[PDB]
Amino acid sequence: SFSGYLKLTDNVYIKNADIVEEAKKVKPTVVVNAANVYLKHGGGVAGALNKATNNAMQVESDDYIATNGPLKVGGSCVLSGHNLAKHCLHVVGPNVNKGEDIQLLKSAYENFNQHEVLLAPLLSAGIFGADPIHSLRVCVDTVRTNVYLAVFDKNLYDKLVSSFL
Ligand SMILES: NC(=O)c1c[nH]c(C2CC2)n1
Ligand SMILES: [Cl-]
Incomplete structure (x- = not known):
């Protein structure tokens, strides 16, 4: 199963790892993608997962959008996990850089509660522009299911662990 994770709370775990490599190794039931409403996986975690x-x-994703239209910010959809996982839960956290509402981060993390265990990135972190410390706080205070957070950036991982309340 998941290895080398630091236990933050009863249900939240964290590791300095590339979520693509964690997914290829573990083949979890659910890998979370840091999606946008259009499911256009250009960069960040989405670009990396899609390239894998x-x-x-x-x-x-394009067929899903052609049929269903865009997701909501704070919303999600379950699609195939392809070679990475059984499923991919595409979750849209607010992108602060595109001027989206940071209050929607809690709604975004609520999607994780529909799955017993997930491999996930820190929502709205990285190129989405939110404070990763705030994202981890919202994660631990919102997600009740077992979430294995893979934080790509080593320096950010160290900062997140060392500042965790
Ligand atoms: N942006 C990220 O959080 C992230 C995770 N994994 C990767 C792969 C190296 C492309 N990128
Ligand atoms: Cl990113």
């Missing part, structure tokens, strides 16, 4: 699927995630 050889663009199959993007092809599937």
Whole structure:
């Protein structure tokens, strides 16, 4: 199963790891993608996960959007996990850089509660522009299911662990 994770709370775990490599190794039931409303997996975690699927995630996502329209900020959809996981839970955290509402981060993390265990990134962190310390706090205070957070950046991982209340 998941290895080398530091236990933050009863249900939240964290590791300095590339979520793509964690997914290829563990093959979890659910890998969370840091999606946007259009499921356009260009960069950040989404670009990395999509590149690992050889663009199959993007092809599937475009068909999903053609049928259903865009997701809501704070919303999610379950699609295939391709070669990475059984499922991919595409969750849209607010992108502060695109001027979206940071109050929607709690709604975004609530999607994780529909799955007993997930491999996930820190929502709205990185190129989404939110404070990762705040994202981890919202995660621990919102998610009740077992979440294994893979934080790519070593310096951020150390900062998150050392400042965790
Ligand atoms: N942006 C990220 O959080 C992230 C995680 N994994 C990767 C892969 C190296 C491309 N990027
Ligand atoms: Cl990012």
